[PDB]
């Protein structure tokens, strides 16, 4: 993967505002800000890579910015951080992974409980919520994920 990052950074605050102001919320998230664990992935780059990770996310997972950026978030599904696309996870519920996959493809909001592992191999249940995000063109370009241990 050779993901490219937006020169000048991402409008994370603007996107959080967009999310809290969305008209027909399918999932209630309650107020959110930059203090919580979150990531923004680019739907328009190969394998929906993380292009921004909040400090709280890195702290929760134990991974560094260098270890997460440019990667699809699925690495959290294995204690060795090695998860190949389309592979059958041995520690994660297949229907759960398919639910996330379909929600992302359809730009549909979703909330799931998925088993994840921190960098040091510590297992935990991640209550994950993903909401599609529109960029300046007004069309869905990113997805913001909010992780909860
Ligand atoms: C912003 C954002 C944040 C995210 N944060 C996290 C996070 O914190 N933790 C995390 O674990 N993931 C996270 N994800 C999810 C991850 O990045 C992938 O989107 C997710 O694993 C599903 O996509 P995939 O490409 O891995 O699917 P695939 O690799 O295709 O795997 C889907 C699995 O489902 C099974 N399956 C497929 N179709 C069917 C079917 N019809 N019936 C039965 N089984 C089926 C397969 O056997 C396969 O193993 C995040 C995604 C985004 C966009």
From TrEMBL:
Asked if the Swiss-Prot or TrEMBL record annotates the protein with the keyword Metal-binding, the reply is yes
Among its keywords, does the record have Metal-binding? yes
**Which residues does FMN bind?**
72, 74, 77, 89, 101, 116, 126, 147
Q: Name one GO molecular function term.
A: DNA binding
Q: Which residues carry this modification: Cysteine sulfenic acid (-SOH)?
A: 36
Where along this sequence does the record place binding of FAD?
A: 72-74, 77, 86-87, 89, 98, 101, 116, 126, 147
Q: Which residues form the PAS domain?
A: 50-107
What's the superkingdom here? Eukaryota
- Swiss-Prot/TrEMBL keywords: Activator, Chromophore, DNA-binding, FAD, Flavoprotein, FMN, Metal-binding, Nucleotide-binding, Photoreceptor protein, Receptor, Repeat, Sensory transduction, Transcription, Transcription regulation, Zinc, Zinc-finger
Q: Which GO terms describe its cellular component?
A: nucleus
Q: What is this protein called?
A: Vivid PAS protein VVD
Q: Which residues of the full protein are shown?
A: 37 to 184 of 186
């Amino acid at each position: 993967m050779h993901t490219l990052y937006a020169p000048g950074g991402y409008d994370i605050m603007g996107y959080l505002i967009q999310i809290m102001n969305r008209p027909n919320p399918q999932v209630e998230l309650g107020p959110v800000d930059t203090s919580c664990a979150l990531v923004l992935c680019d739907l328009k780059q190969k394998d929906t890579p993380v292009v921004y990770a909040s400090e709280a996310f890195l702290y929760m997972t134990g991974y560094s910015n260098a270890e997460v950026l440019g990667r699809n978030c699925r690495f959290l599904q294995s204690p060795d951080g090695m998860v190949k696309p389309k592979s059958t996870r041995k520690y994660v519920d297949s229907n759960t992974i398919n639910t996330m996959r379909k929600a992302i493809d359809r730009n549909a909001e979703v909330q799931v409980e998925v088993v994840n592992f921190k960098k040091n191999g510590q297992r935990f249940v991640n209550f994950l919520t993903m909401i599609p995000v529109r960029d300046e063109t007004g069309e869905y370009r990113y997805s913001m994920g909010f992780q909860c241990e």
